[PDB]
Amino acid sequence: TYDALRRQLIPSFDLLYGSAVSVVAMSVPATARILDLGAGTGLLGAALRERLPDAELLLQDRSQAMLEQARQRFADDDQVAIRVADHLDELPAGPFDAVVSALSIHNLEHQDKQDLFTRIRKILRPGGIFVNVEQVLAPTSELEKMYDRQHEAHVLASDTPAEEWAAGRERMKHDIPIDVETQIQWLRDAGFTTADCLAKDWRFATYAGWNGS
Numbered sequence: 001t002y003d004a005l006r007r008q009l010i011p012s013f014d015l016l017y018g019s020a021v022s023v024v025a026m027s028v029p030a031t032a033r034i035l036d037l038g039a040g041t042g043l044l045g046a047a048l049r050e051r052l053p054d055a056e057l058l059l060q061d062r063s064q065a066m067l068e069q070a071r072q073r074f075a076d077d078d079q080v081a082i083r084v085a086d087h088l089d090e091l092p093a094g095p096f097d098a099v100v101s102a103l104s105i106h107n108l109e110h111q112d113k114q115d116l117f118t119r120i121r122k123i124l125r126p127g128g129i130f131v132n133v134e135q136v137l138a139p140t141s142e143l144e145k146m147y148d149r150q151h152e153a154h155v156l157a158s159d160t161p162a163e164e165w166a167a168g169r170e171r172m173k174h175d176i177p178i179d180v181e182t183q184i185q186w187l188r189d190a191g192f193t194t195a196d197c198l199a200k201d202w203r204f205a206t207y208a209g210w211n212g213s
């Protein structure tokens with residue numbers, strides 16, 4: 001029901017979440033330590049667990065209500081832990097092989113995003129990876145309208161309940177997105193040696209930074 005609704009609301013769900021899982025699996029060992037930042041109900045963590053049965057997952061979010069859904073999802077998983085913390089709070093020490101996030105960091109002020117990327121690099125092993133599945137802003141107001149039309153086209157084609165899309169729109173009024181190339185450059189500024197946009201469907205993109213490679 002919830003997982004079904006996320007697919008209705010998010011264009012190219014399988015491509016974007018799948019790209020995050022694939023780039024992690026090609027970058028870290030089977031026994032990787034992975035932090036999911038803003039894990040919510042643990043959808044990205046769940047996608048990673050499907051590919052990496054031996055990975056240790058730490059799911060972090062500020063919302064206990066969202067993390068209760070993650071606890072239920074991972075009830076029988078002995079290699080999953082949960083941490084309640086804001087992105088702006090001290091990160092867990094790690095070190096981590098991967099830090100991943102989906103549709104969470106766009107909630108922060110731009111300065112706090114730039115600082116967060118730097119703080120993430122500090123808890124990554126050398127050669128570690130940061131991956132973000134993100135809601136991104138178009139580089140112009142005219143393109144932003146086209147991004148919006150493409151998002152709405154997916155939502156309508158997916159037979160999304162009108163009430164859930166209306167609720168989606170209200171949530172998006174408080175979002176602080178920026179264009180994908182600005183954020184990717186912030187990874188370079190944070191001291192990641194490589195940063196790339198792996199996959200994109202207009203408003204939604206999967207990008208990554210590597211801590212040494």
Ligand SMILES: Nc1ncnc2c1ncn2[C@@H]1O[C@H](CSCC[C@H](N)C(=O)O)[C@@H](O)[C@H]1O
Pocket residue numbers: 006037038039040041042043044060061062063066085086087088101102103104107108
């Ligand atoms: N400043 C902040 N610190 C921590 N978590 C935050 C946050 N701002 C938003 N969040 C969390 O980010 C999540 C956004 S929804 C995305 C959930 C999950 N990553 C998924 O892919 O489905 C929510 O769980 C919300 O509580």
